[PDB]
Design an enzyme around this catalytic site. Structure first.
Site, PDB file in Angstrom:
ATOM      1  N   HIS A  58     -53.688   6.469  28.186  1.00 26.87           N
ATOM      2  CA  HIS A  58     -54.720   7.513  28.295  1.00 26.87           C
ATOM      3  C   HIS A  58     -54.427   8.525  29.405  1.00 26.87           C
ATOM      4  O   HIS A  58     -55.080   9.592  29.511  1.00 26.87           O
ATOM      5  CB  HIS A  58     -56.116   6.914  28.422  1.00 26.87           C
ATOM      6  N   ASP A  77     -53.346   0.533  25.297  1.00 25.65           N
ATOM      7  CA  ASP A  77     -53.381   1.561  26.333  1.00 25.65           C
ATOM      8  C   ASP A  77     -52.257   1.327  27.326  1.00 25.65           C
ATOM      9  O   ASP A  77     -52.451   0.796  28.434  1.00 25.65           O
ATOM     10  CB  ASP A  77     -54.749   1.542  27.017  1.00 25.65           C
ATOM     11  N   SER A 107     -56.352   4.012  37.015  1.00 21.50           N
ATOM     12  CA  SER A 107     -55.819   3.626  35.715  1.00 21.50           C
ATOM     13  C   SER A 107     -54.302   3.556  35.783  1.00 21.50           C
ATOM     14  O   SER A 107     -53.642   4.390  36.452  1.00 21.50           O
ATOM     15  CB  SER A 107     -56.269   4.594  34.669  1.00 21.50           C
TER      16      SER A 107
HETATM   17  C1  LIG Z   1     -59.874   9.590  35.767  1.00 23.88           C
HETATM   18  C2  LIG Z   1     -59.584   9.226  34.286  1.00 23.88           C
HETATM   19  C3  LIG Z   1     -58.423   9.986  33.675  1.00 23.88           C
HETATM   20  C4  LIG Z   1     -57.296  10.275  34.443  1.00 23.88           C
HETATM   21  C5  LIG Z   1     -56.212  10.945  33.869  1.00 23.88           C
HETATM   22  C6  LIG Z   1     -56.253  11.335  32.534  1.00 23.88           C
HETATM   23  C7  LIG Z   1     -57.367  11.024  31.751  1.00 23.88           C
HETATM   24  C8  LIG Z   1     -58.440  10.350  32.325  1.00 23.88           C
HETATM   25  C9  LIG Z   1     -59.530   7.749  33.880  1.00 23.88           C
HETATM   26  O1  LIG Z   1     -58.706   6.869  34.065  1.00 23.88           O
HETATM   27  C10 LIG Z   1     -60.769   7.845  33.148  1.00 23.88           C
HETATM   28  C11 LIG Z   1     -61.624   6.925  32.293  1.00 23.88           C
HETATM   29  C12 LIG Z   1     -60.964   6.716  30.943  1.00 23.88           C
HETATM   30  C13 LIG Z   1     -60.407   5.488  30.572  1.00 23.88           C
HETATM   31  C14 LIG Z   1     -59.804   5.316  29.322  1.00 23.88           C
HETATM   32  C15 LIG Z   1     -59.722   6.389  28.425  1.00 23.88           C
HETATM   33  C16 LIG Z   1     -60.261   7.611  28.823  1.00 23.88           C
HETATM   34  C17 LIG Z   1     -60.893   7.802  30.054  1.00 23.88           C
HETATM   35  C18 LIG Z   1     -62.139   5.689  33.018  1.00 23.88           C
HETATM   36  C19 LIG Z   1     -63.539   5.435  32.972  1.00 23.88           C
HETATM   37  C20 LIG Z   1     -64.092   4.359  33.626  1.00 23.88           C
HETATM   38  C21 LIG Z   1     -63.263   3.416  34.307  1.00 23.88           C
HETATM   39  C22 LIG Z   1     -63.785   2.255  34.974  1.00 23.88           C
HETATM   40  C23 LIG Z   1     -62.947   1.357  35.606  1.00 23.88           C
HETATM   41  C24 LIG Z   1     -61.549   1.619  35.624  1.00 23.88           C
HETATM   42  C25 LIG Z   1     -61.028   2.730  34.998  1.00 23.88           C
HETATM   43  C26 LIG Z   1     -61.871   3.651  34.320  1.00 23.88           C
HETATM   44  C27 LIG Z   1     -61.323   4.803  33.690  1.00 23.88           C
HETATM   45  C28 LIG Z   1     -60.857   9.152  33.488  1.00 23.88           C
HETATM   46  O2  LIG Z   1     -61.753  10.115  33.227  1.00 23.88           O
END
Ligand SMILES: C[C@@]1(c2ccccc2)C(=O)C([C@@H](c2ccccc2)c2ccc3ccccc3c2)=C1O
Ligand SMILES: [Zn+2]
Length: 223
Positions: free
Chosen positions: A45, A89, A179
């Site tokens: 992601h 992912d 992430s």
């Molecule tokens: C910063 C970000 C990001 C960074 C770079 C490119 C895209 C998104 C990223 O990671 C997410 C989402 C997500 C997770 C999965 C799919 C989409 C968005 C997310 C939300 C809740 C979580 C809770 C606990 C831990 C991680 C979390 C991750 C973003 O927004």
């Protein structure tokens, strides 16, 4: 990282700070880890139009000689990654050049389930609260591996694909900006941070990297 501590500087020399660039919005940020001198493992992601990788960082706002800012020449996002269920992912980034090995920069390969109840560690530069920016310094936190029923409320969670990480009794958790960072159990990478709740209440969902090791090896060998 919520509820964690500052890492000892450069104590996790495989950690990668990723800047994710897209054509229609500002930079976003992820973690990752160096598994070969020219490959970083992270979450699918986190794919973008281009990505930069910084190795050797502690305080990411302060340039230092340990930094290696490295170009990514190709992104290999898992071919079955699903943007709706978030299955698979996982992504490999091939670096243009091989990283230099230094005290601050080195690889973390992982070999061919760790039982629930074990404590594991995750690190990152992500947000330290719902309403907080990413940490300038690398943070880490000790989290409990959970039985898969603890993640049932994530309706697309699956035990064989994913780890369920973080006792719901605590605030301690990986969060946005973390992430792609590795979960280490007894020093061995077992997961990468994938997703969780917007309100940051743990547990969070990590990709179970053992499931993907054959695919990782197939990318590494062809490239
Ligand atoms: C910063 C970000 C990001 C960074 C770079 C490119 C895209 C998104 C990223 O990671 C997410 C989402 C997500 C997770 C999965 C799919 C989409 C968005 C997310 C939300 C809740 C979580 C809770 C606990 C831990 C991680 C979390 C991750 C973003 O927004
Ligand atoms: Zn330093």
């Amino acid at each position: 990282i919520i509820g964690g501590t500052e890492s000892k500087p450069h104590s996790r020399p495989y950690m990668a700070y990723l800047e994710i660039v897209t054509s229609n919005g500002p930079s976003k940020f992820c973690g990752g880890f160096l598994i070969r001198r020219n490959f970083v493992l992270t979450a699918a992601h986190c794919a973008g139009r281009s990505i930069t990788v910084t190795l050797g960082a502690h305080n990411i706002t302060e340039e230092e000689d340990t930094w290696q800012k490295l170009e990514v020449i190709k992104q290999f996002r898992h071919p079955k990654y699903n943007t709706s269920t978030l299955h698979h992912d996982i992504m490999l980034l091939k670096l243009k050049e091989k990283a230099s090995l230094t005290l601050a920069v080195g690889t973390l390969p992982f070999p061919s389930f760790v039982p629930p109840g074990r404590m594991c560690r995750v690190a990152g530069w992500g947000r330290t609260g719902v309403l907080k920016p990413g940490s300038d310094t690398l943070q880490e936190v000790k989290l409990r591996l959970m039985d898969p029923q603890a993640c049932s409320h994530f309706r697309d969670f699956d035990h064989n694909l994913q780890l369920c990480v973080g006792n719901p009794r605590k605030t301690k958790s990986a969060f946005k900006g973390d992430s792609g960072g590795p979960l280490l159990c007894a020093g061995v990478a077992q997961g990468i941070v994938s997703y969780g709740r917007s309100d940051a209440k743990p547990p969070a969902v990590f990709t179970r990297i053992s499931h993907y090791r054959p695919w990782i090896n197939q990318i590494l060998q062809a490239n």
